[PDB]
Write an enzyme that holds these catalytic residues in place. Structure first.
Site, PDB file in Angstrom:
ATOM      1  N   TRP A 100     -43.418  25.925  65.978  1.00  0.00           N
ATOM      2  CA  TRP A 100     -42.578  25.762  64.381  1.00  0.00           C
ATOM      3  C   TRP A 100     -41.980  23.940  64.535  1.00  0.00           C
ATOM      4  O   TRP A 100     -42.190  24.103  63.501  1.00  0.00           O
ATOM      5  CB  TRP A 100     -41.023  26.558  64.241  1.00  0.00           C
ATOM      6  CG  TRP A 100     -41.288  27.882  64.255  1.00  0.00           C
ATOM      7  CD1 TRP A 100     -41.277  29.127  63.099  1.00  0.00           C
ATOM      8  CD2 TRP A 100     -41.376  29.006  65.291  1.00  0.00           C
ATOM      9  NE1 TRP A 100     -41.695  29.875  63.379  1.00  0.00           N
ATOM     10  CE2 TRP A 100     -41.628  30.633  64.707  1.00  0.00           C
ATOM     11  CE3 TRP A 100     -41.685  29.118  66.533  1.00  0.00           C
ATOM     12  CZ2 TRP A 100     -41.509  31.320  65.010  1.00  0.00           C
ATOM     13  CZ3 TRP A 100     -41.694  30.366  67.484  1.00  0.00           C
ATOM     14  CH2 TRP A 100     -41.970  31.706  66.794  1.00  0.00           C
TER      15      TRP A 100
ATOM     16  N   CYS B 217     -43.749  34.245  62.517  1.00  0.00           N
ATOM     17  CA  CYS B 217     -42.967  35.724  61.706  1.00  0.00           C
ATOM     18  C   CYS B 217     -44.082  36.369  60.583  1.00  0.00           C
ATOM     19  O   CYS B 217     -44.252  37.614  61.254  1.00  0.00           O
ATOM     20  CB  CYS B 217     -41.946  35.194  60.825  1.00  0.00           C
ATOM     21  SG  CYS B 217     -41.498  34.618  59.697  1.00  0.00           S
TER      22      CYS B 217
ATOM     23  N   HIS C 239     -38.847  35.290  55.106  1.00  0.00           N
ATOM     24  CA  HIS C 239     -38.452  35.537  56.709  1.00  0.00           C
ATOM     25  C   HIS C 239     -39.534  37.685  56.360  1.00  0.00           C
ATOM     26  O   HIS C 239     -39.097  37.961  55.846  1.00  0.00           O
ATOM     27  CB  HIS C 239     -37.740  36.093  57.654  1.00  0.00           C
ATOM     28  CG  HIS C 239     -37.312  36.569  59.051  1.00  0.00           C
ATOM     29  ND1 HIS C 239     -38.539  36.549  59.983  1.00  0.00           N
ATOM     30  CD2 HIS C 239     -36.676  37.586  59.248  1.00  0.00           C
ATOM     31  CE1 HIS C 239     -38.605  37.645  60.600  1.00  0.00           C
ATOM     32  NE2 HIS C 239     -37.967  38.309  60.501  1.00  0.00           N
TER      33      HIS C 239
ATOM     34  N   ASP D 187     -38.923  44.727  63.351  1.00  0.00           N
ATOM     35  CA  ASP D 187     -38.926  43.694  63.677  1.00  0.00           C
ATOM     36  C   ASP D 187     -39.970  42.602  64.245  1.00  0.00           C
ATOM     37  O   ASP D 187     -39.392  42.563  65.800  1.00  0.00           O
ATOM     38  CB  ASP D 187     -37.837  42.123  63.537  1.00  0.00           C
ATOM     39  CG  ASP D 187     -38.654  41.139  63.399  1.00  0.00           C
ATOM     40  OD1 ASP D 187     -38.594  40.526  64.243  1.00  0.00           O
ATOM     41  OD2 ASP D 187     -37.936  40.458  62.149  1.00  0.00           O
TER      42      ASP D 187
ATOM     43  N   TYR E 119     -40.819  26.605  56.474  1.00  0.00           N
ATOM     44  CA  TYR E 119     -40.354  28.026  55.827  1.00  0.00           C
ATOM     45  C   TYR E 119     -39.724  28.460  56.435  1.00  0.00           C
ATOM     46  O   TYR E 119     -39.033  29.653  55.900  1.00  0.00           O
ATOM     47  CB  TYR E 119     -41.848  29.270  55.600  1.00  0.00           C
ATOM     48  CG  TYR E 119     -41.543  29.815  57.401  1.00  0.00           C
ATOM     49  CD1 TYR E 119     -41.136  31.659  57.101  1.00  0.00           C
ATOM     50  CD2 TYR E 119     -42.499  29.670  58.304  1.00  0.00           C
ATOM     51  CE1 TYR E 119     -41.210  31.897  58.211  1.00  0.00           C
ATOM     52  CE2 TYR E 119     -42.541  30.364  58.910  1.00  0.00           C
ATOM     53  CZ  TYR E 119     -41.750  31.563  59.591  1.00  0.00           C
ATOM     54  OH  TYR E 119     -42.111  32.357  60.316  1.00  0.00           O
TER      55      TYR E 119
END
Ligand code: ATP
Length: 683
Positions: free
Chosen positions: A236, A272, A330, A353, A511
């Site tokens: 990230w 994600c 997300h 998830d 994001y």
């Protein structure tokens, strides 16, 4: 005598029948709970019901079992206990049968054996192998779907959309799920044969593969959560140089191959939505109806706390730290299945998830949990129900530090957790807002009784305020590469003519909320807000000033704090902007015929004020090409200049196919494009 047998056809009419035609290449693939043809050819003599007595048998796990539902042998009759085999016809020397699997038979590779006793000797041997997948067309299966088009969209459709951008300006990124692209299936089975549950106990695991809820958990988690043996490695910070920018991927097909091809080594960088996407690729392959979903203003990574507090300096700048910001968006997926392990009424969309989040113990992922559950507030339903709830219903409070002691609560009517929850439309390219499937309308009674089964009765709005409101306006759409203005819109519906302190701060964000350096700031300490009027304060966001630290997601967060000294009031307003990428023109030259050349011309017109170097066009699309296609534009593209290039493709399958493309360059990365292409008969 002795039975002969010099052949054993499996036919392709099985493929069309089990909706596994594409998947049917050099190895039969079928869906449980349904029967499939199986012609047998003997030499000289046919089958003699009289003296001949042949029984079938099939094993799957590396450790089969009659009891573990991973192995079973069965008689050959013409009658009809689930694992059956019967004679549907027979003539000359051929003998066509029809086998039937249970609607809960575990999925995987099976070995089909034949037991021949032409009296007392006979011969016993293998006939071949087949892959049994979840059947969404079979009412007896746990993944059954009534609507034919829904079965198509959620199981057979290979192309799709993943929603990104902002809640105020949603953007739909094209994705090639390619679940039926050559090899992808086998990589999926491998993906299962290399997870804990399996290594810890091959039989146990191979057995439970008859449960969509089990398989779902395994697949989901094998994407990231515990990269001890995962498929993608997260990243990230925004430094992907030694891999592939998560935003660069345009389809799971390459990530999966890059995974196996490098001896199952976690593939270089994903996030994600990339996890959710390959997860969808996996489940869809296996037969479990799945659709990737997007949630805006997601209260992710929070420990699940349905209440979040932030402390900001006298500028609304989250002084906080160690505290997780609310995610712009997300993504996770949803899978259609029944829940024979929960108090009936929870069949349907299960939220899975594949993104690990620091939990109330450690770091793993969540789901499957019934969505209807997350809607009711039934936080006790199995599989991380509490997290998915806060993911969509978290509450947030913005405190502002007093430069002389404690903090003062501020009004921030511009934030909402759980926005425009979206996913592609069934059978179309439009977007379908499914936010109503997670939350009851605000105010309603069902919402109150829901926030009660959740103890989330923290909602008594300050409908009083101090006569003022503020929100960020953008005027019109702003594109990536230019300057533009955003406005702090202050409304004053009061007799009083206040004097405030308005602090405006814009910053490039990722994001997930990681705020970068400020790319524009304006502070007025003597703002006059005349009675019953509205004031509009401008903030010039320069390209020159946000270009260095912008992520592939083209996100910039604008923040405004309105302070009223007298009554000492703080009004907070933030908004996430999405800088529009240049479009990608796509022309399909020639006639779209099956097994025939086809050319795609793609253009892009450099929007930056500076040239573009090392420009690359990449194309993919299950149905249009077997392999990815990449072209490199040798020379730089000056400021005005457009780029153009063609790519010869060879459509193999007819029907509809979405061609996804991605443009890469030194100053302009991950700009997407796609085109719907209908491939007809060659004749
Ligand atoms: N982040 C964004 N990126 C690109 N275009 C945007 C963005 N946000 C809004 N727009 C565009 O601005 C125009 C109006 O959008 P919207 O009404 O939401 O914003 P606004 O009118 O400036 O604020 P408001 O409507 O509250 O006065 C539309 O073209 C919308 O798509």
């Amino acid at each position: 005598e002795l039975v002969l047998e010099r052949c054993d056809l499996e036919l392709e009419t099985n493929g069309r029948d089990h909706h596994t035609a594409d998947l049917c290449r050099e190895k039969l693939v079928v869906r449980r709970g349904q029967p499939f043809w199986l012609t047998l050819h003997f030499e000289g003599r046919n089958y003699e019901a009289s003296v001949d007595s042949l029984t079938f048998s099939v094993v799957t796990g590396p450790a089969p079992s009659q009891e573990a539902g991973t192995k079973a042998r069965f008689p050959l009759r013409d009658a009809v206990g689930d694992w059956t085999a019967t004679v549907v016809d027979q003539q000359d020397c051929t003998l066509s049968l029809q086998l039937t699997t249970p609607a809960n038979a575990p999925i995987g590779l099976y070995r089909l054996s034949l037991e021949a006793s032409t009296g007392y000797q006979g011969s016993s041997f293998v006939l071949g192998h087949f892959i049994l997948l979840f059947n969404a067309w079979c009412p007896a299966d746990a993944v059954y779907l009534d609507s034919e088009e829904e079965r198509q969209e959620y199981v057979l459709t290979q192309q799709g959309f993943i929603y990104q951008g902002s809640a105020k300006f949603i953007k739909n990124i094209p994705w090639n799920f390619g679940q039926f692209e050559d090899g992808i299936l086998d990589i999926c089975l491998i993906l299962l044969d290399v997870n804990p549950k399996f290594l810890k106990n091959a039989g146990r695991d191979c057995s439970r593969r008859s449960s969509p809820v089990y398989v779902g958990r395994v697949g989901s988690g094998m994407v990231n959560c515990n990269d001890d043996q995962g498929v993608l490695l997260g990243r990230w910070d925004n430094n992907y140089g030694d891999g592939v920018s998560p935003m660069s991927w345009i389809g799971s097909v390459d990530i999966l191959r890059r995974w196996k091809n490098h001896g199952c080594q976690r593939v270089k960088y994903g996030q994600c939505w990339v996890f959710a996407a390959v997860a969808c690729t996996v489940l869809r392959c296996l037969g479990i109806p799945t659709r990737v979903v997007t949630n805006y203003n997601s209260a992710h990574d929070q420990n699940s706390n349905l209440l979040i507090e932030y402390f900001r300096n006298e500028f609304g700048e989250i002084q906080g730290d160690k505290s997780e910001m609310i995610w712009n968006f997300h993504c996770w997926v949803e899978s259609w299945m029944t829940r024979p392990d929960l108090q009936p009424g929870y069949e349907g969309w299960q939220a899975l998830d594949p993104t690990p989040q620091e939990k109330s113990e450690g770091t793993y992922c969540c789901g499957p949990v019934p969505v209807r559950a997350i809607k009711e507030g039934d936080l006790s339903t199995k599989y991380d129900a509490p997290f998915v709830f806060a993911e969509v219903n978290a509450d947030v409070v913005d405190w502002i530090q007093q430069d002389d002691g404690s903090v003062h609560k501020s009004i921030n009517r511009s934030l909402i957790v759980g926005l425009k929850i979206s996913t592609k439309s069934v059978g179309r390219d439009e977007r379908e807002d499914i936010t109503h499937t997670y939350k009851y309308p605000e105010g309603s009674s069902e919402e109150r009784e829901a926030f009660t089964r959740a103890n989330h009765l923290n909602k008594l709005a300050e409908k009083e305020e101090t006569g003022m409101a503020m929100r960020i306006r953008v005027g019109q759409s702003m594109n990536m590469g230019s300057d533009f203005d955003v406005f702090a819109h202050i409304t004053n519906n009061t007799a009083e003519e206040y004097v405030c302190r308005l602090l405006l701060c814009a910053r490039t964000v990722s994001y997930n909320g990681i705020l970068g350096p400020e790319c524009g700031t304006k502070y007025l300490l003597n703002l006059n807000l005349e009675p019953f009027s509205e004031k509009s304060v401008p903030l010039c966001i320069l390209y020159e000033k946000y270009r260095d630290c912008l992520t592939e997601s083209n996100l910039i967060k604008v923040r405004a704090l309105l302070v009223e000294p007298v009554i000492n009031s703080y009004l907070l307003a933030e908004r996430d902007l999405y800088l529009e990428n240049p479009e990608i023109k796509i022309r399909i030259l020639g006639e779209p015929k099956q097994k025939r050349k086809l050319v795609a011309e793609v253009s892009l017109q450099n929007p930056l004020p500076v040239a573009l170097e090392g420009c690359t066009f990449t194309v993919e699309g299950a149905g249009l090409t077997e392999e990815q296609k990449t072209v490199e534009i040798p020379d730089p593209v000056e400021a005005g200049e457009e780029v153009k290039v063609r790519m010869d493709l060879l459509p193999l399958h007819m029907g509809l196919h979405k061609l996804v493309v991605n443009f890469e360059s030194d100053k302009l990365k991950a700009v997407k494009g796609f085109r719907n292409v209908i491939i007809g008969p060659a004749l």
